[PDB]
Ligand binder design. Structure first.
Ligand SMILES: Cn1cc(Br)cc1C(=O)Nc1[nH]nc2c1CN(C(=O)N[C@H](CN1CCCC1)c1ccccc1)C21CC1
Length: 311
């Protein structure tokens, strides 16, 4: 139940619902930082989905991946405390704009490619890429979410639906690119089997406002045969991707966990009136408990150019 969570967080409103989970806005008491808490019920659960996401996020640390802070499991519930992104979903952003210019699309799309390339570099495929799974953070940069399916029909690759992961992610990014520049899906139908057929055929409308280079890139990402599909490697430095930037997508993590931050370690030891070495030792266990949560939220203060202070 909520007694364990309420020790550390003030709970606010529900900001999202899923089939088996909800996400609530909350504030971390010790740091005053806003967070987003994904809440699951262990009775009405699937559960492998939760464990999959948790394991992935413990191993992924990247400027375009929504950060995990804290995992709490009670008798009845599982709580995942995640980064709060105050800019909302990419999908809702596209609808409000109708569609994005090629220029703004490229700004956003390069961030998606950065995240997904990194995910692949760490040995995973996301498998559920869609604009509902991309959020805008405090600096209006994109953060990828929902790793429950890592190793929706409108975004699934032909070979994935066929049951015949890396290439499947490229296809989904092709659908995303189309939606960004067009404001609607390339394959859509009320009838699910009719949608399946359309995806298998691979034919789609090419709107009048797409540039020849955009058209070519969509063609290369939306190849029905995954062997003919552009590879992640060649996506990183694609001429469309390079335009106006003149350097390939920077996919490597810019915020990896190397050494513990001295300033964060000191603030925790001072606040808790604890032996510094004991504090450094307990943080290093990386249990994703309240200690880890407080440590990581202090690091976020620092990344924001703010002082590392508690209470
Ligand atoms: C929608 N919105 C509007 C504003 Br302003 C901020 C947000 C917002 O969602 N912020 C936010 N920050 N961090 C998170 C979110 C939403 N959020 C989510 O994880 N949201 C997903 C959203 N889905 C995509 C397809 C269906 C479910 C979710 C997953 C399970 C249950 C409910 C929601 C995270 C927790 C990591």
């Amino acid at each position: 139940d909520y007694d364990e969570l309420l020790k550390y967080y003030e709970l606010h409103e529900t900001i999202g619902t899923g089939g088996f989970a909800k996400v609530k806005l909350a504030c971390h008491i010790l740091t005053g930082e806003m967070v987003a808490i994904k809440i699951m019920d262990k009775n009405t659960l699937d559960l492998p989905r939760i464990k999959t996401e948790i394991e992935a996020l413990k191993n992924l640390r990247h400027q375009h991946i929504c950060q995990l802070y804290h995992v709490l499991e009670t008798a009845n519930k599982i709580f995942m405390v995640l980064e709060y992104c105050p800019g909302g979903e990419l999908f809702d952003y596209i609808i409000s704009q109708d569609r994005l210019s090629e220029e703004e699309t490229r700004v956003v799309f390069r961030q998606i490619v950065s995240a997904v390339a990194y995910v692949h570099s760490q040995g995973y495929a996301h498998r559920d890429l869609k604009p509902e799974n991309l959020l805008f953070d405090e600096y209006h940069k994109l953060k990828l979410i929902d790793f429950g399916l890592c190793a929706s029909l409108a975004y699934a690759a032909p070979e994935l639906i066929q049951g015949k992961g890396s290439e499947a992610d490229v296809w989904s990014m092709g659908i995303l690119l189309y939606v960004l520049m067009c404001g609607f899906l390339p394959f859509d139908d009320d009838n699910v089997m009719a949608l399946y057929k359309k995806i298998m055929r691979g034919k789609y409308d090419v709107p009048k406002w797409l540039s020849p280079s955009s058209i070519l890139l969509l063609q290369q990402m939306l190849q029905v045969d995954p062997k003919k599909r552009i590879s992640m490697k060649n996506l990183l430095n694609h001429p469309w991707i390079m335009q106006d930037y003149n350097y390939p997508v920077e996919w490597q993590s810019k915020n990896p966990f190397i050494h513990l931050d001295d300033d964060c370690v000191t603030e925790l030891s001072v606040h808790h009136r604890n032996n510094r070495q004991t504090m450094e030792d307990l943080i290093s266990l990386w249990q994703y408990d309240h200690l880890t949560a407080t440590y990581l939220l202090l690091l976020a203060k620092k990344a924001r150019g703010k002082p590392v202070r508690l209470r």
